[PDB]
């Protein structure tokens, strides 16, 4: 042993579950809402299903310039009107 | 007789906290429709 309390003890203790029957569902629900609110899309810049192409476009918005790549992506996004 | 907040505690939670958050997200994703 290395001094920490055995996991067997902890996870079969009442207090552990008083704490975690709150903290685990809270986290789960938080992640859920991170998706359902749509925040994930905006944080990571991921296309929603209607934002991969403009309506009559069929050309991938591939980044082609290293140093003005940011401006490129921005223009691409504006192109979705 | 035992400490609560140890190196092990930290390690464990740096893995476990994001994991449950993430599983909540992926769960939500299962109901996204195109």
């Amino acid at each position: 042993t290395t001094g920490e309390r055995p996991f067997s003890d902890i996870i079969t203790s009442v207090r552990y579950w008083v704490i975690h029957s709150i903290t685990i569902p809270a986290l789960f629900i938080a992640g859920w809402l991170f998706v359902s609110t749509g925040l994930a899309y905006d944080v990571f810049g991921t296309p929603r299903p209607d934002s991969y192409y403009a309506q009559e476009q069929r050309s991938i918005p591939l980044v082609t310039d290293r140093f003005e790549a940011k401006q490129q992506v921005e223009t691409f996004l504006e192109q979705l009107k | 007789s035992y400490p609560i907040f140890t190196v092990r505690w930290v390690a464990v939670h740096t893995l476990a906290v994001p994991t449950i958050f993430f599983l909540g997200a992926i769960a939500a994703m299962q109901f996204i429709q195109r």
Partner: peptide, 30 residues
């Protein structure tokens, strides 16, 4: 952004709750 508060309200409520429950043992440890 209201979404970050609506989303990270469960996380901070969890943190606050467990802090409430573990406070005496934490003080005893520290």
């Amino acid at each position: 952004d209201w979404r970050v508060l609506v989303v990270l309200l469960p996380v901070l409520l969890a943190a606050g709750w467990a802090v409430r429950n573990i406070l005496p043992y934490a003080v005893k440890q520290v």
